Design a protein around this nucleic acid. Sequence first.
DNA 1: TTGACTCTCTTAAGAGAGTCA
DNA 2: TTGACTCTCTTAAGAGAGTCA
Lengths: 162, 162
Amino acid sequence: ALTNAQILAVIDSWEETVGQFPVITHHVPLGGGLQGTLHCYEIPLAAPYGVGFAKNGPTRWQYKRTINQVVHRWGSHTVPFLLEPDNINGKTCTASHLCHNTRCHNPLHLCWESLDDNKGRNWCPGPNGGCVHAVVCLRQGPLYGPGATVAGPQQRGSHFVV
Amino acid sequence: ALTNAQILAVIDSWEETVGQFPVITHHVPLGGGLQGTLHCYEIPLAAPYGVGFAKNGPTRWQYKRTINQVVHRWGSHTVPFLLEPDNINGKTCTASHLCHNTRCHNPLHLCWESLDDNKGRNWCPGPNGGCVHAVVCLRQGPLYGPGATVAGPQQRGSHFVV
DNA sequence: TTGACTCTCTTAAGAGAGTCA
DNA sequence: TTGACTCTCTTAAGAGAGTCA
Ligand SMILES: [Mn+2]
Ligand SMILES: [Mn+2]
Ligand SMILES: [Zn+2]
Ligand SMILES: [Zn+2]
Ligand SMILES: [Zn+2]
Ligand SMILES: [Zn+2]
């Protein structure tokens, strides 16, 4: 098994490589009518992506390193969390984009949490709009708002009460 | 079926059958430390379910009627909305449980909206905790709260900024 | 050891359609 | 005509593993 020192070395090489990705400045809603700025380190749209990186899906990548003749591979956003527990409350931990930008690999824009917690950030009002996430959101979720409901609750007769 | 009269007859037959489902009272968080009461009309756990109803999955049912000697079949929660547009902004419209209770078929607990709007209600603070849904929530979403994040954003070196 | 592709899978909110009696 | 089963699919947040040079 990889030692803690070897895992730390993997995280360090990953950080070195991701740190050289193009850094893109994005202005984002924070909630409460306020605007903030995030700096995303974005993996390229097409090969080559960077040393150790390869695309396994339209918005999916993996990181690969060969140690003592054994090939090791990880989901490209999971590497910052290799020294953390990988489940909680019986749920698998997932890499969760606080910036809601899939191509971004900035570890300051990622957290490690259940898929339900991950998804829910899409609708959060944001750090200046009432976010209650213990690990605070960096921005208002992209899907926050009144929604676009086509039809609401309704009945033709009198068979029901709310 | 095709005619508006035939569709109204389908909606009326569905309402009459679901109106005879057992009515189960559920006390629910509203947000803001307040509690409310919902009356769900719950499809039975096992056959028989009611005239026209059959189970296609653990928590999935369909409604079927024979019109003009042809069988017409719908997802069991879609029937109230048969006169509504079936898409919005190029996204499929879905039946969305305001009571977060799959077995419930009370149309006063259903709305018709994109899958994204639908999902997002799971994390809504609720009608007394800040819900901004234009078609208002009936309760706080079951997944609202601080979450259980295992690890937050972090870096080992000095290559990244927020 | 490395790059650039290939494939299928998970989850939890939702769907359509066929086989028998 | 009606009932009670069977199967796979959609979406958008996420995954693991194979092949070839
Ligand atoms: Mn996410
Ligand atoms: Mn729902
Ligand atoms: Zn980012
Ligand atoms: Zn938040
Ligand atoms: Zn209900
Ligand atoms: Zn709401």
